[PDB]
Design an enzyme around this catalytic site. Structure first.
Site, PDB file in Angstrom:
ATOM      1  N   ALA A   1       0.816  -1.225   0.000  1.00 45.66           N
ATOM      2  CA  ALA A   1       0.000   0.000   0.000  1.00 45.66           C
ATOM      3  C   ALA A   1       0.848   1.273   0.000  1.00 45.66           C
ATOM      4  O   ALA A   1       0.396   2.330  -0.457  1.00 45.66           O
ATOM      5  CB  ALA A   1      -0.954  -0.012   1.192  1.00 45.66           C
ATOM      6  N   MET A   2       2.078   1.151   0.505  1.00 40.89           N
ATOM      7  CA  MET A   2       3.023   2.260   0.549  1.00 40.89           C
ATOM      8  C   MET A   2       3.713   2.559  -0.789  1.00 40.89           C
ATOM      9  O   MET A   2       4.234   1.655  -1.454  1.00 40.89           O
ATOM     10  CB  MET A   2       4.141   2.033   1.592  1.00 40.89           C
ATOM     11  CG  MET A   2       5.006   3.305   1.746  1.00 40.89           C
ATOM     12  SD  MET A   2       6.139   3.545   3.038  1.00 40.89           S
ATOM     13  CE  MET A   2       7.427   4.269   2.132  1.00 40.89           C
TER      14      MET A   2
HETATM   15  C1  HEC Z   1       1.172   7.455   2.680  1.00 42.99           C
HETATM   16  C2  HEC Z   1       1.018   7.831   1.205  1.00 42.99           C
HETATM   17  C3  HEC Z   1       2.614   7.141   3.136  1.00 42.99           C
HETATM   18  C4  HEC Z   1       3.706   7.938   3.124  1.00 42.99           C
HETATM   19  C5  HEC Z   1       3.859   9.393   2.625  1.00 42.99           C
HETATM   20  C6  HEC Z   1       4.782   7.163   3.724  1.00 42.99           C
HETATM   21  N1  HEC Z   1       4.339   5.895   4.075  1.00 42.99           N
HETATM   22 FE1  HEC Z   1       5.405   4.444   4.960  1.00 42.99          FE
HETATM   23  N2  HEC Z   1       3.839   3.254   4.912  1.00 42.99           N
HETATM   24  C7  HEC Z   1       2.559   3.552   4.424  1.00 42.99           C
HETATM   25  C8  HEC Z   1       1.690   2.396   4.566  1.00 42.99           C
HETATM   26  C9  HEC Z   1       0.202   2.329   4.141  1.00 42.99           C
HETATM   27  C10 HEC Z   1       2.427   1.406   5.127  1.00 42.99           C
HETATM   28  C11 HEC Z   1       1.929   0.008   5.447  1.00 42.99           C
HETATM   29  C12 HEC Z   1       2.103  -0.867   4.186  1.00 42.99           C
HETATM   30  C13 HEC Z   1       1.614  -2.252   4.409  1.00 42.99           C
HETATM   31  O1  HEC Z   1       0.789  -2.651   3.545  1.00 42.99           O
HETATM   32  O2  HEC Z   1       2.031  -2.906   5.393  1.00 42.99           O
HETATM   33  C14 HEC Z   1       3.752   1.934   5.358  1.00 42.99           C
HETATM   34  C15 HEC Z   1       4.794   1.246   5.935  1.00 42.99           C
HETATM   35  C16 HEC Z   1       6.057   1.737   6.181  1.00 42.99           C
HETATM   36  C17 HEC Z   1       7.147   1.020   6.825  1.00 42.99           C
HETATM   37  C18 HEC Z   1       7.028  -0.423   7.331  1.00 42.99           C
HETATM   38  C19 HEC Z   1       6.532  -0.431   8.781  1.00 42.99           C
HETATM   39  C20 HEC Z   1       6.462  -1.795   9.419  1.00 42.99           C
HETATM   40  O3  HEC Z   1       5.939  -1.828  10.596  1.00 42.99           O
HETATM   41  O4  HEC Z   1       6.914  -2.765   8.798  1.00 42.99           O
HETATM   42  C21 HEC Z   1       8.212   1.854   6.888  1.00 42.99           C
HETATM   43  C22 HEC Z   1       9.597   1.579   7.483  1.00 42.99           C
HETATM   44  C23 HEC Z   1       7.824   3.110   6.286  1.00 42.99           C
HETATM   45  N3  HEC Z   1       6.496   3.004   5.864  1.00 42.99           N
HETATM   46  C24 HEC Z   1       8.601   4.235   6.146  1.00 42.99           C
HETATM   47  C25 HEC Z   1       8.238   5.426   5.574  1.00 42.99           C
HETATM   48  C26 HEC Z   1       9.098   6.589   5.459  1.00 42.99           C
HETATM   49  C27 HEC Z   1      10.538   6.669   5.975  1.00 42.99           C
HETATM   50  C28 HEC Z   1       8.376   7.550   4.825  1.00 42.99           C
HETATM   51  C29 HEC Z   1       8.785   8.987   4.436  1.00 42.99           C
HETATM   52  C30 HEC Z   1       9.960   9.050   3.456  1.00 42.99           C
HETATM   53  C31 HEC Z   1       7.077   7.003   4.553  1.00 42.99           C
HETATM   54  N4  HEC Z   1       6.987   5.711   5.024  1.00 42.99           N
HETATM   55  C32 HEC Z   1       6.040   7.658   3.931  1.00 42.99           C
HETATM   56  C33 HEC Z   1       2.211   4.764   3.888  1.00 42.99           C
HETATM   57  C34 HEC Z   1       3.008   5.865   3.715  1.00 42.99           C
END
Ligand code: HEC
Ligand SMILES: *Cc1cc2c(cc1C)nc1c(=O)[nH]c(=O)nc-1n2C[C@@H](O)[C@@H](O)[C@@H](O)COP(=O)(O)OP(=O)(O)OC[C@H]1O[C@@H](n2cnc3c(N)ncnc32)[C@H](O)[C@@H]1O
Ligand SMILES: *Cc1cc2c(cc1C)nc1c(=O)[nH]c(=O)nc-1n2C[C@@H](O)[C@@H](O)[C@@H](O)COP(=O)(O)OP(=O)(O)OC[C@H]1O[C@@H](n2cnc3c(N)ncnc32)[C@H](O)[C@@H]1O
Ligand code: HEC
Ligand SMILES: Cc1ccc(O)cc1
Ligand SMILES: Cc1ccc(O)cc1
Ligand SMILES: [Cl-]
Ligand SMILES: [Cl-]
Lengths: 74, 515, 515, 74
Positions: free
Chosen positions: A48-49
């Site tokens: 989703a991310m």
């Molecule tokens: C919304 C459009 C997001 C933005 C902007 C960022 N992230 Fe994200 N992240 C999003 C979702 C919906 C998810 C879950 C995905 C899934 O289906 O599991 C995540 C997950 C992460 C993770 C993993 C976390 C875990 O517990 O395993 C990380 C490390 C992460 N996101 C980092 C991250 C960073 C550093 C961002 C800014 C550069 C960032 N995300 C933006 C949604 C969104």
């Protein structure tokens, strides 16, 4: 740098989805997530991310945000 | 490994060598670990089908002109992106495998924001968040209009794809004024009043003189937009957001027909959203798994249960009033009487909802305040699979009901849901349907692809076509608009891009086609 | 006697023979006594320079396709007119001597006027008077927007030249939605949603999918418009017209700067007119001869005398409020306070002016009621000589003052008057200047031609260009917009009209040019 | 015909400029102006007055308007 600090990257981009009040993505604050892992999720994207290219969020900024996230309370 | 269609490893190497000499080494990306973030798609096809061969980052117009000169020499096809956040529409990945991505995110300069004349002139890499910060820091009395990805997306990219916002300046391309385009021959063209030396009217008067070409470049591959101007709404003294919750699925006919005279007369001046129960649920961050784990679509019984537990309706309309206190008060009296006279739907205001979701984000979106709250739609089923089916309809109730039923049926057939919303203009509806599925499940992606094909086939038969579509279906949708149109589009393409280098396949325009 | 440029008497005869066989004998006009009414021009040049070789009248799309097939065979250049009432812009006469006029006045069918969705689909020959009659007879709750020649002019012709009206739907091309164009190869192209079979959204959603080309055909020679759709404003319950009379010439700066926030916020939703004393005089049917017979321009002393005797000001602004009684009352309170706070200008209403001119016609123009009252401008000096110099400016007071002074100076130099008005949009002004002269006097026409050249030279130097111009100056104005623009326009022209048959010279687009 | 009657041509076109209350052009009502003269002014146009082609106002309609104008009181 490109975002100045890691707090700034988190406020302007990541936190819009990751902050506790939002909840689109899981809480990353004070979870002790490795810099190498955060670098992998942002560059590859996870389900989703979306993925962000270096031109949007560079390597140096990823290091800063990883460090900022580890320093906060859970 | 991955090379452009028709280009040999040798010709590509000379091109990459020239790219490096012109831009520098850190501005040319050829290693697969650097290319990986551009490949992420939410389409029902593997990454390989839309994988780039390289990615170049230009910062000045002179460099874009350079990249285009090199591309014409070695017949290299370029795919231009600005902020590249086109989720559900192809993302940052090319229409065709092996194209080079001209990534203009680094061109992030805000050239001018005039607070008196209320306009903005920006570069491709400018984000709406970057603009919001500049407006907050400098205390400018202007308001922004943006798509839901707001903070991470930008004006240039969204308007090139003719996207939609939620303020009175919602139909973004209607508010566009002046653009600079780098043509395939290297020339820098400026629409409207831009060609006049010493002009101060580029962002003032739209048309100019002679043919007005801004529209020709949007949703097309006839040039690379390097600068774009648009009009900004002045900040009104009072903003009054509201919601009107409706109980039955069949209420859509009366909601639309009652809303129309209010939109046409400009009483409700903004793009109104009428969100379905499942769209509303996804945006409030409710998942399907916390209600049912049964395969196929979400049954009517669990949707009715969802309505009781949370207070959502079958249709949830969000609108907004702008102006002076006295202007808002008389308009509120007009809107209130229309809904009372209907004898349907509960009216909820900012006082009785305030800090609760989804009211909070919609109120923010209608006043130009960024949030990424709507991304909860991808959490409804998860998996990272999402495509936008967005047909166009008349802002007439019977038509909305007909389209709703047609969509719901074809989606249920493939075990997917009807998670949709109507974005309302005085005369048209952008019927936006999110075909959500699990991309990690290979059987469900194969179903999603088939579902999207059938959705297009079913709607075309009834005379309906989409206003925008993903990279995988761009050629398919081009067919809905007839042969004469495609013929004209290929004639213009041969004239402005004889070597076929500017994003071939965009909107179904490619010189390798027989037109 | 008069033949098309480059075409021999023999090839022309085969063409006229084919025209007759296709259309009939009464639809092909080759005799000079039948051609005479198409030749009347108000430009400072002799009729011979814009005289047609023939005139054909088509009634169906099949016939237009026919005329174009014949024209491609014998390399015959056609000049298309709809209602042909383009006074001060070339009238009904061609850009170049000897072109054949494709007169589409006989194609006067009103295809559809939808009272619920508020739109109209018409043929080229439909006049605004014909539409007003249909709306009155059938009691439709729609309102029209038109140019001042209203009754005698039409929607298709005015919008192809991107003309302006006075209601909230004033910028006519902004309200256009869907058009059918017959291309040079004979093909029938429909913009927006028209290409979709069984579509009911042609006049509903503007853009469609892929490049949106409506703009490309306006002020261009890339096709012949045969059908055009546009949006109509629904009739508001109450209409409140008003005027604000100002005394000093220097008051323009404060009027514009005070009016801008009201236009931008849509409090005053219509195209506001700020008319100069001499424009106001001409429209009230006052002649120069009843005030002075002295040669040259009208002195400041006799203009000041004109103001005392009649009650007109240096600047006369006409605006209008629309909506419900309560909507109009709060907006009237906002407008009134803005003018009271200024401490300038007298406010005159419908009660204290009512049946007197020019208030009566302006009130009619702002509510879609036809009148040809404004033609009194041609009686100011008489002689039948009139050209429109219409530069574009920012809706900023200092700019309006600057343009006014620049114009006034160059006009006085040739012994002509500054009879002008500003048509106001939220951000732009259409600064419309009527360079009036006596065409029967050969010395004064020679001066008028020189004056027009200097007006263009003076304004271009300060970075200003015109939005529309007469047939004699169309190539000259094309130069104001730079070489790259012209180059792109000739590339598209070679692609859609390789034989150069569609109105060569229109907007300076001709394949015989080196671009 | 094309305009039906001469009263109709006068109301829909000519009278917008020629009616006494307007006064853009001179009064033509009850002036006994010859049909051949009216035909010349409309086809050639006269100074400030525009010319109308046959496709707009035909020969038959000019005859009718000439006759209608002669029959009215001055
Ligand atoms: C919304 C459009 C997001 C933005 C902007 C960022 N992230 Fe994200 N992240 C999003 C979702 C919906 C998810 C879950 C995905 C899934 O289906 O599991 C995540 C997950 C992460 C993770 C993993 C976390 C875990 O517990 O395993 C990380 C490390 C992460 N996101 C980092 C991250 C960073 C550093 C961002 C800014 C550069 C960032 N995300 C933006 C949604 C969104
Ligand atoms: C996931 C999601 C997507 C949404 C949305 C809500 C959610 C949860 N809400 C949207 C909304 O309210 N309104 C919209 O119009 N879109 C919504 N979307 C989709 C959204 O992601 C996009 O609309 C938009 O923001 C696209 O993002 P973008 O702004 O980053 O644009 P882009 O850079 O990806 O460019 C888009 C498209 O334009 C062409 N191209 C880009 N730049 C140029 C230049 N300079 N020259 C020529 N062509 C150009 C190109 O084809 C590109 O793919
Ligand atoms: C004399 C006068 C003129 C005015 C005016 C007041 C006075 C006293 N007030 C105007 C106003 O408020 N706003 C305007 O926009 N114009 C005013 N004008 C000038 C006025 O005469 C014209 O605007 C307009 O009504 C022109 O007349 P028209 O409507 O009859 O248009 P046209 O047929 O002459 O066509 C104009 C132009 O368009 C091109 N062309 C026409 N039709 C086609 C088709 N079907 N396909 C392709 N090109 C077409 C052509 O170049 C033509 O000359
Ligand atoms: C306004 C645009 C007009 C319309 C529509 C018609 N006429 Fe006209 N007409 C107009 C003017 C301004 C003038 C005076 C021209 C001048 O410089 O003197 C005229 C004049 C005439 C005349 C001549 C009368 C005379 O005193 O000798 C005639 C016979 C005439 N007009 C006829 C006419 C007819 C039949 C019309 C409808 C088809 C018509 N006019 C329309 C302005 C306008
Ligand atoms: C919310 C939204 C609107 C339009 C669109 O095309 C996609 C998503
Ligand atoms: C009244 C007017 C307005 C515009 C124009 O171009 C001519 C005349
Ligand atoms: Cl995608
Ligand atoms: Cl003219």
């Amino acid at each position: 740098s490109q975002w100045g600090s890691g707090k700034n990257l988190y406020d302007k981009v990541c936190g819009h989805c990751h902050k506790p009040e939002v909840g689109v993505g899981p809480v990353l604050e004070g979870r002790g997530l490795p810099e190498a892992y955060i670098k992998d999720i942002v560059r590859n994207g996870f389900r989703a991310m979306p993925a962000f290219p270096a031109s949007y969020v560079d390597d140096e900024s990823l290091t800063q945000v990883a460090e900022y996230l580890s320093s906060l309370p859970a | 490994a991955v090379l452009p269609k028709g280009v040999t490893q040798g010709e590509f190497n000379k091109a990459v060598q020239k790219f490096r000499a012109l831009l520098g080494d850190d501005n040319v990306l050829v290693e697969s670990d650097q290319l990986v973030p551009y490949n992420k798609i939410m389409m029902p096809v593997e990454n390989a089908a839309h994988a780039p061969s390289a990615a170049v980052t230009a910062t000045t117009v002179e460099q874009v002109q350079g990249v285009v000169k090199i591309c014409n020499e070695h017949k290299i096809p370029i795919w231009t992106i600005s902020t590249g956040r086109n989720f559900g529409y192809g993302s940052a990945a090319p229409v065709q495998r092996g194209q080079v991505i001209l990534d203009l995110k680094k061109m992030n300069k805000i050239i001018k924001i005039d607070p008196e004349m209320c306009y903005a002139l920006v570069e491709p890499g400018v984000t709406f968040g970057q603009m919001y910060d500049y407006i907050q820091e400098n205390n400018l009395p202007v308001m922004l209009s943006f798509s839901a990805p707001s903070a991470i997306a930008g004006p240039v990219g969204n308007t090139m794809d003719r996207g939609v916002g939620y303020t009175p300046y919602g139909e973004h391309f209607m508010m566009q004024c002046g653009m600079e385009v780098v043509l395939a021959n290297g020339d820098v063209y400026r629409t409207g009043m831009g060609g006049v030396p010493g002009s101060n009217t580029w962002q003032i008067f739209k048309w100019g003189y002679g043919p007005t070409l801004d529209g020709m470049f949007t949703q097309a591959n006839y040039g690379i937009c390097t600068k774009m101007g648009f009009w900004l709404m002045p900040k009104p003294p009072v903003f009054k957001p509201f919601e009107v919750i409706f109980e039955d699925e069949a209420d859509i006919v009366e909601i639309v027909d009652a809303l129309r005279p209010l939109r046409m007369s400009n009483t409700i001046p903004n793009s109104v959203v009428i969100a379905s129960t499942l769209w509303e649920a996804g945006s409030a961050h409710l998942t399907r798994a916390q209600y049912t784990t049964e395969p196929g679509h979400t049954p009517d019984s669990v949707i009715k249960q969802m309505q009781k537990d949370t207070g959502m309706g079958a249709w949830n309309l969000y609108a907004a009033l702008y102006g002076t206190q006295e202007q808002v008060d008389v308009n509120w009296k007009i809107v209130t009487d229309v809904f009372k006279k209907l004898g349907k739907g509960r009216i909820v205001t900012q006082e009785e909802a305030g800090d609760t979701q989804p009211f909070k984000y919609r109120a923010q979106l209608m006043s130009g305040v960024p949030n990424l709250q709507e991304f909860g739609l991808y959490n409804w089923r998860g998996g990272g699979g999402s495509m936008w089916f967005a047909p166009v309809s008349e802002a007439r109730g019977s038509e909305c009901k007909k389209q709703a039923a047609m969509a719901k049926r074809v989606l249920h057939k493939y075990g997917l849901d009807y998670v949709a919303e109507f974005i309302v203009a005085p005369r048209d509806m952008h019927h936006v349907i999110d075909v959500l599925y699990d991309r990690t499940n290979p059987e469900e992606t194969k179903r999603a692809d088939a579902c999207f094909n059938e959705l297009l086939d079913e709607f075309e038969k009834e005379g309906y076509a989409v206003y925008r579509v993903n990279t995988r279906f761009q050629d398919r949708v081009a067919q809905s608009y007839g042969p004469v149109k495609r013929k004209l589009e290929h004639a213009i393409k041969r004239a402005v891009d004889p070597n076929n280098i500017l994003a071939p396949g965009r909107s179904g325009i490619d010189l390798n086609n027989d037109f």
